[PDB]
Amino acid sequence: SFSGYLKLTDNVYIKNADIVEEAKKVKPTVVVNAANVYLKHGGGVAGALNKATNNAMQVESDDYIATNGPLKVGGSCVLSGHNLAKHCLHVVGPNVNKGEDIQLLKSAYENFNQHEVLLAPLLSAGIFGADPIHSLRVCVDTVRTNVYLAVFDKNLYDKLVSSFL
Ligand SMILES: O=C(O)Cn1ccc(Br)cc1=O
Binding site membership of 133 for ligand 1 (Cβ less than 6 Å): no
Give the DSSP per-residue string, 57-123. HHHHHHHHHHHH-PPPTT-EEEEE-TTT-SEEEEE----GGGT--TTHHHHHHHGGGGSSEEEEPPT
The experimental technique used to determine this model is: X-ray
Number of folded domains that form the chain: 1
- Residue 138 Cα to ligand 1 middle (Å): 16
CA angle 58, 63, 67 (to 5 degrees): 145
- Residue 14 Cα to ligand 1 middle (Å): 13
Domain housing 143: 1-165
Binding site membership of 151 for ligand 1 (Cβ less than 6 Å): yes
CB 151 within 8 A of CB 18: no
Binding site membership of 152 for ligand 1 (Cβ less than 6 Å): yes
